Amino acid sequence: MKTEWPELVGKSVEEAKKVILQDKPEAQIIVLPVGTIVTMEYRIDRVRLFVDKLDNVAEVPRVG
Amino acid sequence: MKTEWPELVGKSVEEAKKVILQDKPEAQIIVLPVGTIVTMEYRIDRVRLFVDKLDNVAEVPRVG
Amino acid sequence: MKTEWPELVGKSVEEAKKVILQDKPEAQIIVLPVGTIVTMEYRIDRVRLFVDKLDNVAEVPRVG
Amino acid sequence: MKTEWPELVGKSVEEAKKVILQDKPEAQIIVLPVGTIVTMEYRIDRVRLFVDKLDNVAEVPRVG
Amino acid sequence: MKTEWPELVGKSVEEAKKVILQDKPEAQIIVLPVGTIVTMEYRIDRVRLFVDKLDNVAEVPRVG
Amino acid sequence: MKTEWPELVGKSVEEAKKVILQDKPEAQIIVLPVGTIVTMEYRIDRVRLFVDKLDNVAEVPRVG
Amino acid sequence: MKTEWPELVGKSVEEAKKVILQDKPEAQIIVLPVGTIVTMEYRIDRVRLFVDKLDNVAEVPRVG
Amino acid sequence: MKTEWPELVGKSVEEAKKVILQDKPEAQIIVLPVGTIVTMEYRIDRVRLFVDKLDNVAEVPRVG
Amino acid sequence: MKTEWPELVGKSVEEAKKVILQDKPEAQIIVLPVGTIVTMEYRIDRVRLFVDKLDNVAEVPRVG
Amino acid sequence: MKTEWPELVGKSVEEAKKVILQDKPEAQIIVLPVGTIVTMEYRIDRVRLFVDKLDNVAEVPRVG
Amino acid sequence: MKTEWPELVGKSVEEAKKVILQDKPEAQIIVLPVGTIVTMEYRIDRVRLFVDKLDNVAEVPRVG
Amino acid sequence: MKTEWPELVGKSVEEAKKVILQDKPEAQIIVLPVGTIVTMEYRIDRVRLFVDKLDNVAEVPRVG
DSSP: OOOBOGGGTTSBHHHHHHHHHHHOTTOEEEEEETTOOOOSOOOTTEEEEEEOTTOBBOSOOBBO | OOOBOGGGTTSBHHHHHHHHHHHOTTOEEEEEETTOOOOSOOOTTEEEEEEOTTOBBOSOOBBO | OOOBOGGGTTSBHHHHHHHHHHHOTTOEEEEEETTOOOOSOOOTTEEEEEEOTTOBBOSOOBBO | OOOBOGGGTTSBHHHHHHHHHHHOTTOEEEEEETTOOOOSOOOTTEEEEEEOTTOBBOSOOBBO | OOOBOGGGTTSBHHHHHHHHHHHOTTOEEEEEETTOOOOSOOOTTEEEEEEOTTOBBOSOOBBO | OOOBOGGGTTSBHHHHHHHHHHHOTTOEEEEEETTOOOOSOOOTTEEEEEEOTTOBBOSOOBBO | OOOBOGGGTTSBHHHHHHHHHHHOTTOEEEEEETTOOOOSOOOTTEEEEEEOTTOBBOSOOBBO | OOOBOGGGTTSBHHHHHHHHHHHOTTOEEEEEETTOOOOSOOOTTEEEEEEOTTOBBOSOOBBO | OOOBOGGGTTSBHHHHHHHHHHHOTTOEEEEEETTOOOOSOOOTTEEEEEEOTTOBBOSOOBBO | OOOBOGGGTTSBHHHHHHHHHHHOTTOEEEEEETTOOOOSOOOTTEEEEEEOTTOBBOSOOBBO | OOOBOGGGTTSBHHHHHHHHHHHOTTOEEEEEETTOOOOSOOOTTEEEEEEOTTOBBOSOOBBO | OOOBOGGGTTSBHHHHHHHHHHHOTTOEEEEEETTOOOOSOOOTTEEEEEEOTTOBBOSOOBBO
């Protein structure tokens, strides 16, 4: 089971989605601009994407 | 009476609305971007949705 | 004289306006996104509306 | 059951405690400096006190 | 010389401009969303307008 | 009835208290450090003092 | 395995510690003032306590 | 060498650009909304413009 | 009339006070930690000092 | 190996991209508005661009 | 070379120091309260400790 | 003339002072906790120190 996708920094949301879903079929992908403060609630099926102005993944996606 | 919809994380606002209204007919649904600070005022008939950039429910909806 | 409109949570700005103006003819209605910090200056003729992303009234409108 | 103590603005935490406990025997009193942002979690047995630099109640205490 | 326009709360930026310029011919009108923090620099010829989502004047315009 | 004390900027909290109470016998005086964000709730009997590091009144006290 | 201690709201840090350690022997207890923003990093052995000015547990302790 | 343009408050970005470039031929003009916090890094060839909602210069442009 | 004291950066609050009072006999000196956001209210008789952890003047004192 | 591009302040994102990629072929370019707070995670292959309203590079690009 | 100390969460600053210095003899240990925003500047010899109110390490120490 | 002291990260304020004053005799040293936002005003004779909880220099001191 993987929990992080270091190889996705700089890639678009379309192609980060395709990778994560290949590796984590029940993933609930959430797309947030970098800098958003999240409430501390852990979900194992969730994968948050923090994107830049061009909607490219800006940081390492992790489950939570 | 239900007060939370864990099964709605990742779903769109259209289909989260349909579920909540099935379960909570007098629900007043409020849609806010994740990260918004709310004033601490409890309403039993209110259901706030915290959405991502794609307007998908990002966190567990709860009454309040 | 009324000072609050609890029955307006979840309604649109068009129809919150109509209600307030029926009850408070000299009302100066101000529409702000939820989360905006206001300067502490009291105006008796003012009614601020704090709206969600769909421009629905998110909290209880009060005079001030 | 009361849910608010308007008559406690300006009073000390010692004497706000005594009043609330007279009226709400299972009250869990929480003392926070004014300006603290709280997580939106409703507790019926909780009474938060927002105090000034002199630990005097600065705003109207309410259950939540 | 006037320094404040209490009668402009709720009016649009077009018609607040017309009033201020009638009363203060060298006015440099600056339009900011309510909630913006300004740097503390005093200008006698400046009039800042703090507007709501509908671009209506939300607070009392003052010189500075 | 007075609602503001421009003549109190720079004075200590002890002597601002004495003035306000002379003019406003039922005043509930609240002492907050400058910069504190307050919840928008109007109280006619309340007088908030915004103080500096030396507990001197830093801004013009007003009722609210 | 328990992950939350609803019965600890209002209790002191000394006696919240004793309870958690009875139920979760490898717990790493972290004490933070309410309002602190945490980095989103999940630890199963960690239990964060959010305390008020009197160091009483202010919110429901949860593992993470 | 000039380092500030007090006469540019209220003017548009097009005509502030023309002035600055007349006076400071190697100027790197940066346009930011008023309220943006900048990292403390000094550049002698840079001129930041802090603009209002109408893209009018809101504060005194300075080199840095 | 002077309005700024560039020569006071790095000096203590005791000796900045002595200078300002020599030059501005009716000065109301307010001492705030650097970083404090002030409400935009201009007072000609006020001189705010923004100090570091050692209470040394950190920035250029100005009237306002 | 270069780690900073001082000569790119004021240039557009298109032409900053071309320069960085000439010098750092595996660069993952991330475009963020000035003022965005980033999580402290170091990546050697990443180059963040902090842009103004006109998408011009506002600060010195560095690897990280 | 190690870059992280997962086994130090919950331990005091005295004993986190001893561990890090055993593993990283030239370490420059910096102790910050959890929640502090740092400037994005990478130092290989630096190890920041984010501590709780009891000065216990609250998060995983990493080099940077 | 030096403008930065990379070799001072981790050292105390007493001994950072001694170094800077050896190299920059007219230095006005300002000590601020890490995380403080400064107003963008450049002073060539100023050296700001950003310190941790133990008053150790946490970041690279620079003139400004």
